[PDB]
Structure 1
């Protein structure tokens, strides 16, 4: 019944060791040299969502102690209570005693410590340094402003840069090795550009386009399948809509917008982002154009975030683009 193949691709391909963590080479190398030399100071991982922080720290805990990491290592994620009455009793008692199985330094992993109250961090500020020669703290976080400056200073800061194109490409190749599948180069480029650094969105849309093949053993995943699985607008009709808005008149521009956004069931929130990304490359010969072009589009996006209407906002986008592309003449 239960096996490794039932897990979703988000977790099925979790890096077991540090060797299976691509991208963050400049941090994995330093961590491996830390654990090799014998010294491992208080760490603080800080990175965007889905970069490899938790996987890296779990692989490190496995490498240090053994194949049984969740035995002498404490782990306080956001699922457990982490009030001041917890950092007083539990963390202090764990940091004040020895291990039960072997003789080594203890590891405490405070995952997502940005969700801790200021009093809890202020209490941890002294217990993190009172017992140093026996335990080590690892603070994982995504927002580096929730942490107080004191706790932020006591830990060595390691930033997890978003995965570059080469790392995601290597991971895609490794996944395509284990799973019988074929993926097109232009589809690969589209997937990389849609990833936005997120390693989880990659595997999610990959499982989706694999499921939408009807025979995931012979036919290759083309760009159309990827664009359909997430409903993202293809660059083709996106550039077509932008050109029709910039050049044509009002009636035909509204008609072609309503025809493109109804041919595949696109969303205006994605069209706005696509048009912004395509139009950021233009060379506007004035500063007053870009100011309005960004302000009105951001206002329309914030209004879409509340879901007022659906066509009034589209015509508002059209009008904002047209009125912004008027100071040029």
Structure 2
């Protein structure tokens, strides 16, 4: 790196260093801590969605086992490094079959993002894992479990990293606010958690952008409005008004309301579609075909939007689909 840690992005500045700084995965953290505290470390696998703390957890565990010099006592490989059959057959085998250079102890191999590895390399890894288990332990990290071969999964003990809970996100936000000398409104925190979707990376990025947005962060307070302008996301009031107009007004009024709401702050149609879907999924529809039509048509519109197209036609299609689907309610 260069200069102090204050030059780093918040996603990297607040990376957990120890195992007590990881939040939202209490069960997994406790289990791994107990395993490391008694020498009962098996071949580990961490399966989870993006931005949940798998890499942070494994690096913290390696630091706990070895110490500050963990980088000189582990073999860490990821998607940026070639991991072909030759690599598995030579480099990994040599690392697993040899003693530590610096200080005594067992050998740890961290194959981060192993789901990117080919089937041949994973197959070659089988006996490598099973033969040097006396002195070596393997850790695998994955987001998609369908890419891993059945045998490799069979040889590993699985741990699932759940989407981050609300309480853990609030505690981390409190720590970040205290360190950064920031003030966050309760509704601002609510909006941040809602838009995070269980990812701490999104929380930290949005909070950094909000801090940048404030003119005088020293005594200014971050409000839900700041989040909405920073992210460009529709306000809940805007979504509610659009849905109300679509559901109990004529086509002209609905079109005018949608256009005005979108042009007030330059909102995107995709965010509106997601918001309306979230609102409608809480509705109690009398008829199932209403929900079926809503889901099918909105999914089609979302797929069409994903490839460009005409924005006005797409908005009119959204309005018409909602109206037609709700006509079935009677």
The TM-score bracket by the shorter chain reads over 0.9
Task: State the SS of the aligned residue for 1:74.
Answer: strand
Task: State the SS of the aligned residue for 1:217.
Answer: coil
- For each residue in 1:137-180, what CA deviation from the matched residue of structure 2 results, as whole angstroms up to 9, or x when unmatched? 00000001000111011100000001100000000000011111
Task: State the SS of the aligned residue for 1:215.
Answer: coil
- Structure 2 distance, partners of 1:250, 1:171, is 46
Deviation of 1:68 after TM superposition, in Å, equals 1.3
Task: State the SS of the aligned residue for 1:261.
Answer: helix
Task: State the SS of the aligned residue for 1:108.
Answer: strand
TM-score if structure 2 supplies the norm length? Answer: 0.99
Larger helix percent: 2
Task: State the SS of the aligned residue for 1:263.
Answer: helix
> Equivalences for 1:63-212 in 2 at 5 Å?
63-212=64-213
Deviation of 1:85 after TM superposition, in Å, equals 1.1
- Structure 2 distance, partners of 1:280, 1:25, is 31
- Structure 1 distance, partners of 2:193, 2:96, is 43
- For each residue in 1:64-90, what CA deviation from the matched residue of structure 2 results, as whole angstroms up to 9, or x when unmatched? 001111101000011100011110111
Gap regions ≥5 residues in structure 1: none
- Structure 1 distance, partners of 2:286, 2:253, is 27
- Structure 1 distance, partners of 2:266, 2:217, is 25
TM-align CA RMSD: 0.6
- For each residue in 1:100-119, what CA deviation from the matched residue of structure 2 results, as whole angstroms up to 9, or x when unmatched? 11111110000000001111
- Structure 2 distance, partners of 1:265, 1:26, is 43
- For each residue in 1:17-57, what CA deviation from the matched residue of structure 2 results, as whole angstroms up to 9, or x when unmatched? 00100110000000000000111000000011000000000
Gap regions ≥5 residues in structure 2: none
- Structure 1 distance, partners of 2:129, 2:279, is 48
| Count of residue pairs brought into register by the alignment | 329
- Structure 2 distance, partners of 1:58, 1:161, is 18
Task: State the SS of the aligned residue for 1:145.
Answer: helix
Q: Name segments (4+ residues, structure 1) moved above 3 Å.
A: none
- Structure 2 distance, partners of 1:51, 1:199, is 7
> Equivalences for 1:18-33 in 2 at 5 Å?
18-33=19-34
